[PDB]
Amino acid sequence: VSTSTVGARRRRAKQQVDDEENATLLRLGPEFALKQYDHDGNEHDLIALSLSESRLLIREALKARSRARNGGVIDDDELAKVTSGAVANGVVKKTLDYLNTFARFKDEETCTAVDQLLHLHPFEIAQLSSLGCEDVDEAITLIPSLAAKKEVNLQRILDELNRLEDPY
């Protein structure tokens, strides 16, 4: 039905088992290669999004479109009624509410601070932001790929994440 920029995938003599999606082994399949191409043929890094980025973009896109539907005229339950159809109403409401209960940095002030702090494979950089951690010991266990990289700063990463983190 719907297709992408990546095409053909004609048969090759040697098979491959670096295709099976394994986040531990950095296998994201043929569609989510490290170097993608946009609809003009230009080269582009894979766009993986943390929970904090994603909350701003999706909410902005929905209210800008909602304003556009109103000729140019906050709460998650109100923002999800913009969609068309009960099937669409469901997936969008559940995604905001899920993000509403797990996004630490729920505003653009803190988020841009986290944005500048983080901006080396692009997938790992996005993983560190999504999974909250206390110490260096907790990060290399649950995410065993950070082992043999020999470039920490990790502690100051976690300290800034936890300091920017508002109380609850």
Partner 1 sequence: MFFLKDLSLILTLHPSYFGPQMNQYLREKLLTDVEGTCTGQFGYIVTVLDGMNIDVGKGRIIPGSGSAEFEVKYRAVVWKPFKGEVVDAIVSNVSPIGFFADVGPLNVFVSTRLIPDNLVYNPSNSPPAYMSNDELITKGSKVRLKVVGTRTDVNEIYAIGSIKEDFLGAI
Partner 2 sequence: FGEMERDCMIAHGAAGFLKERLMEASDAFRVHVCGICGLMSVIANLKKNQFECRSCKNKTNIYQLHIPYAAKLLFQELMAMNIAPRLYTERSG
Partner 3 sequence: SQFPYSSAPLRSVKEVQFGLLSPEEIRAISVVKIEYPEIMDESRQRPREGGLNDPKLGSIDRNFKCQTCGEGMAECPGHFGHMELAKPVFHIGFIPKIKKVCECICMNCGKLLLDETNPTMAQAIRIRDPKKRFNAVWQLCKTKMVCEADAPSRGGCGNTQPVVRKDGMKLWGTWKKSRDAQPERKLLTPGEILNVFKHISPEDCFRLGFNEDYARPEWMIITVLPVPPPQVRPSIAMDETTQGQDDLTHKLSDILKANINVQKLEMDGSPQHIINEVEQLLQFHVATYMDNDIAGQPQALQKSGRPVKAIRARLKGKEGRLRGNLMGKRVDFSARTVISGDPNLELDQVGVPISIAKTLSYPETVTQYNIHRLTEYVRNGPNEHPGAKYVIRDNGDRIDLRYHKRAGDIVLQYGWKVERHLMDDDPVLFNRQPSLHKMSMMAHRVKVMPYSTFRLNLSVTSPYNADFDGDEMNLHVPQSEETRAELSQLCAVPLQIVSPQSNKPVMGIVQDTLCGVR
44 or 156: whose CB is closer to partner 1?
44
Interaction of residue 115 with partner 1, rule CB under 8 A: no
What would the x/- binding string for partner 3 be over residues 12 to 31, using CB under 8 A? xx------------------
Site residues, partner 2 (CB under 8 A): 7-11
Shortest gap between Cβ of 2 and partner 3 (angstroms)?
10
To 10 degrees, what angle do helices 108-118 and 51-69 make?
A: 130
Residues present in the chain in total:
168
Q: Would strands 35-37 and 43-45 be described as parallel, antiparallel, or unpaired?
A: antiparallel
Least distance (Å) from partner 3 to the CB of residue 30? 18
What CA dihedral angle connects 35, 37, 43 and 45, to 10 degrees?
A: -40
- Minimum CB distance to partner 2 smaller for 12 or for 35: 12
Q: For partner 3, which is the closer residue by CB, 73 or 87?
A: 87
Decide: helix, strand or coil at residue 35. strand
Q: How would you class 105 by CB atoms within 10 Å of its CB: exposed for 0-12, middle for 13-18, buried for 19 or more?
A: buried
Backbone region of residue 42 per phi and psi (left: phi > 0; alpha: psi in -120 to 50; beta: other values): beta
Cβ nearer to partner 2, comparing 7 with 72: 7
Binding site for partner 1 (CB under 8 A): 1-5, 20-25, 28, 31-32, 36, 38-39, 46-51, 54, 57-58, 61-62, 65, 68, 83-85, 87-88, 90-92, 94-95, 98-99, 101-102, 131, 138, 141-143
